[PDB]
């Protein structure tokens, strides 16, 4: 039995301004009684109402999540949130906590590229975006076309790894269609990071021709 507690994505923190944190429990041996899952804050202030979700697994396990909306002033100013899971089959409770990640702050650099035509793929093009040298590692990445954000499942983004220097880096890949760039031949790679200034947003445009 494991427990995980995330931060809010910098998208929900600075774009939506509605940040949430998720407490996750994968169950080793499930099906006993009911699992209790509660929240607390370091400052003693109240916690909003969480949303309780669970889904059974095909490998015989049970997954239980609880999402807690948190303030933006609260998170940035460094509040500590705490999740406490209790199970009738565990001797004592599991507990995880989350807070603003420490360390120096550095803004991301963003570079967007497009691949040339590949014979046998005259109506597909692949776009790439390199975001590097930012810290801390929390970063959100979206692709905008015709000024409407694209479905997040249209692209893939690597988990942040370290540069030679002090920053982190990620890559993002997006296959676009001929119909899309013939409609408007501009795509945006937007990165949301707390150290970016202003509005925590750095972006770059890329074209296919």
């Amino acid at each position, epitope marked *: 039995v494991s427990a995980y507690l995330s931060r809010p994505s910098p998208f929900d923190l600075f774009i939506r301004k509605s940040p949430t944190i998720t407490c996750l429990v994968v169950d080793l041996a499930p099906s006993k009684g009911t699992v209790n899952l509660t929240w*607390s804050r370091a*400052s003693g202030k109240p916690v909003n109402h969480s949303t309780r979700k669970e889904e059974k697994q095909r490998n015989g396990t049970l997954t239980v999540t609880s999402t807690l909306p948190v303030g933006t002033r609260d998170w940035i100013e460094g509040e500590t949130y*705490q999740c406490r899971v209790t199970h009738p089959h565990l001797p*004592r409770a599991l*507990m995880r906590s989350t807070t603003k990640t420490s360390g120096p702050r550095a803004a991301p650099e963003v570079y967007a590229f497009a691949t040339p035509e590949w014979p046998g793929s005259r109506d597909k093009r692949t776009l790439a975006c390199l975001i590097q040298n930012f810290m801390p590692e929390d970063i959100s990445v979206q692709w905008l076309h015709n000024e409407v954000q694209l479905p997040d499942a249209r692209h893939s983004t690597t988990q942040p790894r370290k540069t030679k220097g002090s920053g982190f880096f990620v890559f993002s890949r997006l296959e676009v269609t001929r119909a899309e760039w013939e409609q408007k031949d501009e795509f945006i790679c937007r990165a949301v990071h707390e150290a970016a200034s202003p509005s925590q947003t750095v972006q770059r445009a890329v074209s296919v021709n």
Partner: antibody, heavy 121, light 114 residues
């Protein structure tokens, strides 16, 4: 970072009054966290005394209730420990402390230098 | 009167650097609630303010070295210093947060041999 600075301790005769203050800097006591006074007789253990929470909720120790009063000043971001009828047992070093919260129970994570109160003979 | 009394043991101990120290804190009542035990541990180097080490029996306060660990439940709690560093000779207090009024132990003086 949050910082706490006691002041006001010194030599005082029994049955008198003495006011101790804990100047908070780096955080505002109205968005707290609990704020406490904890004392320690010379060479003996620690004893919890009183606490004000961020909304103004006070709590006291039975062993001092009646003759000791906690209060705050949002405009000065200072909270005080009013001591009336100083007894011999009140000779101690008084620390103020910020209590972090954990599911209805509090631990004292940030402390001050402390201040020395001495009750005359 | 009906406070929760905390007895610590040993009340005083001599050790060398690298040694393993085990401090006990026994309580007059159970301090359990909701699957946790609300017993915290503090360190007080001479002449200075206490410092929070562990809270809720076993959770290490941020910035505290990992050689400090907390264990126990109910009325039986133990602080463990796995490898005594030289900056660790101080008095260690336990404190329960289960019910008002919050009470401490009497302290375990950890002194250096010689």
């Amino acid at each position: 970072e949050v910082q706490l600075v006691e002041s006001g301790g010194g030599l005082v005769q029994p049955d008198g009054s003495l006011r101790l203050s804990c100047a908070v800097s780096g955080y505002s006591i109205t968005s707290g966290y609990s704020w406490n006074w904890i004392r320690q007789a010379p060479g003996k253990g620690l004893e919890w005394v009183a606490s004000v929470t961020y909304d103004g909720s006070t709590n006291y120790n039975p062993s001092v209730k009646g003759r000791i009063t906690i209060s705050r000043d949002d405009s000065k971001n200072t909270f005080y420990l009013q001591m009336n009828s100083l007894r011999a047992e009140d000779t101690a070093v008084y620390y103020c402390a910020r209590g972090s919260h954990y599911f209805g129970h509090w631990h004292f994570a940030v402390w001050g230098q402390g201040t020395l109160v001495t009750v005359s003979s | 009167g009906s406070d929760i009394q905390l007895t610590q043991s040993p009340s005083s101990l001599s050790a060398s650097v690298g040694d393993r120290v085990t401090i006990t804190c026994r309580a007059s009542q159970s301090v359990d609630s909701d699957g946790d035990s609300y017993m915290n541990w503090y360190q007080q180097k001479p002449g200075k303010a206490p410092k929070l080490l562990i809270y809720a029996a076993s959770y290490l306060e941020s910035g505290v070295p990992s050689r400090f660990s907390g264990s126990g439940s109910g009325t039986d709690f133990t602080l463990t210093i796995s490898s005594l560093q030289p900056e660790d000779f101080a008095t260690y207090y336990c404190q329960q947060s289960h019910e008002d009024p919050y009470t401490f132990g009497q302290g375990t003086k950890v002194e250096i041999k010689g």
